[PDB]
Symmetry: C4
Subunit: 331 residues, 4 copies
Amino acid sequence: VPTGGDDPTKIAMLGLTFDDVLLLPAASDVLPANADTSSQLTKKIRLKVPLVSSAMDTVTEARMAIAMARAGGMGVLHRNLPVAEQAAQVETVKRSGGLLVGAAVGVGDDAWERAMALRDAGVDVLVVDTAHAHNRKVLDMVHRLKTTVGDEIEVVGGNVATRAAAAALVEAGADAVKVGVGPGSICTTRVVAGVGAPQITAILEAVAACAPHGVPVIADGGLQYSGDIAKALAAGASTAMLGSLLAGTAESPGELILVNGKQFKSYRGMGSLGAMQLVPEGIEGRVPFRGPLSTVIHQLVGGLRAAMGYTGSATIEELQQAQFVQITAAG
Amino acid sequence: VPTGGDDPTKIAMLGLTFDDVLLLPAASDVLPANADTSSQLTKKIRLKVPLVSSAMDTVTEARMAIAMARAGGMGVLHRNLPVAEQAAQVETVKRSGGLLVGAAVGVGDDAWERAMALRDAGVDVLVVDTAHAHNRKVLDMVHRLKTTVGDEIEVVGGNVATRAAAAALVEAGADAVKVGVGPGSICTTRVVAGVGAPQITAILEAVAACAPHGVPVIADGGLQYSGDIAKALAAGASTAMLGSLLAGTAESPGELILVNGKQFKSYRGMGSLGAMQLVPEGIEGRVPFRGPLSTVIHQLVGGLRAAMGYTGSATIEELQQAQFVQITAAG
Amino acid sequence: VPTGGDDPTKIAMLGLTFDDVLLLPAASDVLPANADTSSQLTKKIRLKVPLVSSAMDTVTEARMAIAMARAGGMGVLHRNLPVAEQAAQVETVKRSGGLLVGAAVGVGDDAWERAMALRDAGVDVLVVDTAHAHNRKVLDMVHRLKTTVGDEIEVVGGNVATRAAAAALVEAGADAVKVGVGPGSICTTRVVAGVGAPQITAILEAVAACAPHGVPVIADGGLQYSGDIAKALAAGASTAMLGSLLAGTAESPGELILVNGKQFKSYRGMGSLGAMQLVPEGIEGRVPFRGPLSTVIHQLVGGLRAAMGYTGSATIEELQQAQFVQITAAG
Amino acid sequence: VPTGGDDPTKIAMLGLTFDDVLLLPAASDVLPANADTSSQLTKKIRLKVPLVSSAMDTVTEARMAIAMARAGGMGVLHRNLPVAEQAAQVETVKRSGGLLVGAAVGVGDDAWERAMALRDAGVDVLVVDTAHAHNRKVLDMVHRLKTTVGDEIEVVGGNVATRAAAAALVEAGADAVKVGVGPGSICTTRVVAGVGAPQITAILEAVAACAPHGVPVIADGGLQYSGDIAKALAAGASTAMLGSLLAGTAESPGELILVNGKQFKSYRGMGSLGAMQLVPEGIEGRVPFRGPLSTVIHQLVGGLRAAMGYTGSATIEELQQAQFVQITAAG
Ligand SMILES: C[C@H]1CN(S(=O)(=O)c2cccc3cnccc23)CCN1C(=O)Nc1ccc2c(c1)OCO2
Ligand SMILES: C[C@H]1CN(S(=O)(=O)c2cccc3cnccc23)CCN1C(=O)Nc1ccc2c(c1)OCO2
Ligand SMILES: C[C@H]1CN(S(=O)(=O)c2cccc3cnccc23)CCN1C(=O)Nc1ccc2c(c1)OCO2
Ligand SMILES: C[C@H]1CN(S(=O)(=O)c2cccc3cnccc23)CCN1C(=O)Nc1ccc2c(c1)OCO2
Ligand SMILES: O=c1[nH]cnc2c1ncn2[C@@H]1O[C@H](COP(=O)(O)O)[C@@H](O)[C@H]1O
Ligand SMILES: O=c1[nH]cnc2c1ncn2[C@@H]1O[C@H](COP(=O)(O)O)[C@@H](O)[C@H]1O
Ligand SMILES: O=c1[nH]cnc2c1ncn2[C@@H]1O[C@H](COP(=O)(O)O)[C@@H](O)[C@H]1O
Ligand SMILES: O=c1[nH]cnc2c1ncn2[C@@H]1O[C@H](COP(=O)(O)O)[C@@H](O)[C@H]1O
């Protein structure tokens, strides 16, 4: 084996991230303005815009979930707060009309009670929200939710970064599989634990397990540019979950911060010391202030529309069949 | 598949840019001073110097087109201005002697009228000027022009970045095919849409479709150094179109700008907010002031001549047969 | 041969370092808090924590060896000092309870006398401490020690970076093989001599020779993050030796240094001019002050535990079977 | 073809530079102090130290040639000066004892007269000094010199970067072949002409043509560290020619320059505007002042000796059989 040892499987794959690839232009009769950006969030729920906001306490509370739903996407309410409060945020979103909303739950002691309170509040999507879904506790939670409230509520499981892990969630009954172990902008898992999976390869592998069962993949983490949304969907994801790209917006939690004449907002990992309050796997940082969500989403969707025009993709299902070119460091 | 999924065609190629390769020296009896730099712009038009200036409003108006023609190349007049004015710039270039000149047209409502006004003004080359020529509207425009005014006017189509797209333009009747989707110095398509094609690979692929039909390829975008001109031609292009490298010159539109003691000129993408006035795919920037065009062209051609000496290429047609070595990031 | 010449063996391998790989998550029922971090230092000695401190005069004297043993690892006392003093440091560590301790010896004139004085002082591990163990003098020293004091003392040999070199140490009787030629943070061997071996590949190759004989591999040098510890063990090492990561701690030799408002400690290679006092193969540098050792070890072990959770490794022997993904420069 | 087009030979090789490889340690009974560093400069001339100074007007005049010879290497006197003066510098070196000395000649009108004046002055080595030796004029000059003065004078030809070019020089009668097109620290040929060949691959290819005919290869350009000398020799070169590494020394031409409190000397390409006085292929720069040559050579040879110890190379001929590991950008 060229890289050492005698086991060809020790280094299992070459992992590509978004920056490693570009979408190739293809024959197109699709104008960007006329592309259909709708896509499956879950087996039953289709969004007008294939974007959901991260379940983080510096990204999604009720204000963000309302704005996301109104822009045609969805918010996933974070779970770093009392059950009663999270449930009350779900109610607040429902007070603002017939708006879709999701909410995160863990697999800890209080997770089941949280899930039931969220169901009672009228939540549409429960997101079983872990760093590692390839685990019997997580698979059991997904399965139990699906068997208990699955007729009325769609159940997302995550996160995973391999084909086997995605397959396990599918078998447990997940209505969507969320992909991303280690790629987040505020993530330090790669350096703390040495664990991760570059996101284009992780998506390609998860989709290989999920698409044949009609289960949509949510690409979660590592998206830095609107072009990354198109790349993630072309790799086969059906939606993208965004943290950093939405944390700078007016609708995200937190105050404006002024440093050296420029405006920022705080953005922190849910595994940072601050969020957990220990061996943290995220940092506390800041992102540039970006203005209203509606405006940010317009630009992100605009980039996606451009990609759909270049690739001749009339729908997201067509974009999922687009081809890449791999690029070098020089590119 | 080592990079993920089970489809070997999902990642279709490894795309190389100029910085990824060097020309290998070869047996040579060619002195740089004696190399013949002439090359086909189109099937019928041969230039003394294989360089044309970009159809951009911070690169080519009448002054630049005149200087380019006099230096042995050609200018392509930009189309971000009224039809009457563009036509009047064509006339101005013709007032300055028997000088070749080209002009850009789109495929919009006013494009046909623009094309006819340019023909009436005496234009030599019409450049159907789009970001994505692999499209029925663009192919139809090329074909219609070629069938209508093709006896007197050469018709260039672009831009493309794949073999299939180049083949389509050839079949539509293009007299030259322009290659470059995403490589421009002021381009943000790669980050906004996630779309692009590294230029050495794009040229190699376009040439595979164009050379067998005797259709010249114009390498457009991404050329940063005189050495890149030689690389582009060696990959099989017949001419290079330059934006950034010519925008700093006296003959380009725009005033001198002084910042921190150094001289610059503005250089902006035609897809920047400023040029379009929205989801822009270019930036507004600045380039160092470079002095007279004649001097810049002398240096660029000097570098090309050096390459022809090292590779033993007496003509551009010989240079098109030269070989590369691929280099690493360290190189 | 694509890279030149006609000999496929001239460039023998593609060498990967820690930064080139990530651990892939796998099915897991292992909680990080419940993982067993114990591992073989040598054939007979098992540590609670798979970490030993470098035999360097800015990393390990008696204070560090005591703290390392108490944290569940071990210190290797440096040998840049008189025999009587090194022996006295061994005694000092033994005065502090039933604590494991190692000590370095060379292969020079005084090395045997040093080894015997260390044995008399009660040392548990002798580390034959060289930059290049693939040498008859080094192999002879290992063998002689093992045949003379091997019933009571475990004998480590190093350093190596190839399968053949590791095999030679195994045959000489080593109780552990230490791997690392050129990877240290303060090392300049790569630039001075042009010699080295990227550490993931070096570990994979050494383990291929050592594991079949039940000889543990100590990964020595180049570990910059807690995640690198997990990577090294997953590549098949049984323990990691740390210099830079422990040199910033309270228990390391040397005073606090204040530069530009921040706190540092000096950290220097044993092949630096200063340490040898000439063609040095190390630098004299500084590392950020890190606080108490106990705290640093907690964080390092915390990262390892996280990796064990993600990979489903209940023990270090299980972690040694984990798989990698290779990543690109972009990642 | 993965990188584009249908011709597998268009991109002929993957070119490695020094930074792309490391020497692998091997079984060794060689102490660095006892290695034999002697090596063939030409078929007949063996140096004690395998180093020659570049024929550049900021590196080698009589003072440098004397110091190089005394250190066991050789200087090549530059030719950017009148014939009478260059000849007088050769005489000056001969006045200082039985010291070896070389001198550069071109292939221009005055080159033959220069060569004869140098022969009359007692030169030992004539270096036919060009940027591209794969040329009938250069091959003819080499052949004519060898047939005319070859009994008393060794004739070096260069530069080349391919197997074919090296083969041509061998057939012309060269006593050594100098390798390096584009790698020099002050070289801009790579960006001006787009031409070059990474030096490890260039050496491997040249050696494939030269070693079977018993013709030594001189590695010229791109050596930045003492470790690069060992790499070049291991790739099969017999000596290394140094510009940048020797330009900072007391014995090089030029005055000390003080900028921002630090000491430098000027170092310029022979293809820079300044040296030629136009399309330059070198820059005018500065290098840190390094002190006496004797000291610099001691450190360079010290690094080489270290490499010989690590690789078990008792002689340079043994070092030429050493193996590499290829490293990644991360390494
Ligand atoms: C505190 C939580 C959440 N984060 S996080 O906030 O940083 C985080 C949140 C969401 C997605 C993430 C995607 N990649 C990295 C971290 C992500 C990391 C640590 N953590 C775990 O649950 N770790 C863990 C890991 C493996 C296990 C296990 C527990 O028990 C069985 O096997
Ligand atoms: C405003 C124009 C021109 N630019 S530009 O100014 O930035 C630009 C100009 C010239 C060459 C370019 C080479 N690469 C990138 C951009 C380039 C980009 C956006 N644009 C389009 O026409 N986009 C578009 C794309 C695909 C389509 C489609 C329209 O309809 C069918 O399929
Ligand atoms: C002074 C000592 C120790 N260092 S060090 O302090 O920089 C050093 C110490 C420990 C581990 C190291 C891992 N890689 C690099 C250097 C390391 C380097 C120089 N050195 C040698 O012994 N060199 C040497 C090399 C090869 C030989 C040989 C001697 O005789 C036969 O073959
Ligand atoms: C002025 C001289 C010397 N230099 S230099 O000073 O920059 C230079 C000097 C020495 C080694 C060099 C190694 N690589 C690059 C440049 C090097 C470059 C330009 N030059 C040439 O002779 N160029 C040339 C090239 C190819 C030809 C040809 C002439 O006629 C036939 O084919
Ligand atoms: O602390 C953390 N460490 C690692 N990943 C996190 C953490 N907090 C949230 N995440 C994940 O990172 C995603 C956001 O990534 P981003 O959009 O690149 O910033 C989130 O949706 C989570 O999946
Ligand atoms: O706004 C833009 N975005 C992307 N490409 C552009 C834009 N404007 C012009 N171009 C193309 O970029 C080329 C100039 O590239 P440059 O020489 O690298 O600066 C032009 O000839 C166009 O093909
Ligand atoms: O001067 C030196 N040059 C090269 N390697 C050294 C030197 N001194 C110590 N080492 C080795 O570098 C290891 C420390 O590496 P680090 O943890 O990356 O700083 C040590 O355990 C030694 O194996
Ligand atoms: O102007 C120049 N351009 C390119 N190569 C040069 C020039 N002048 C000298 N050289 C070559 O560069 C070598 C020095 O390279 P260096 O040791 O990397 O600085 C010289 O021995 C020449 O072969």
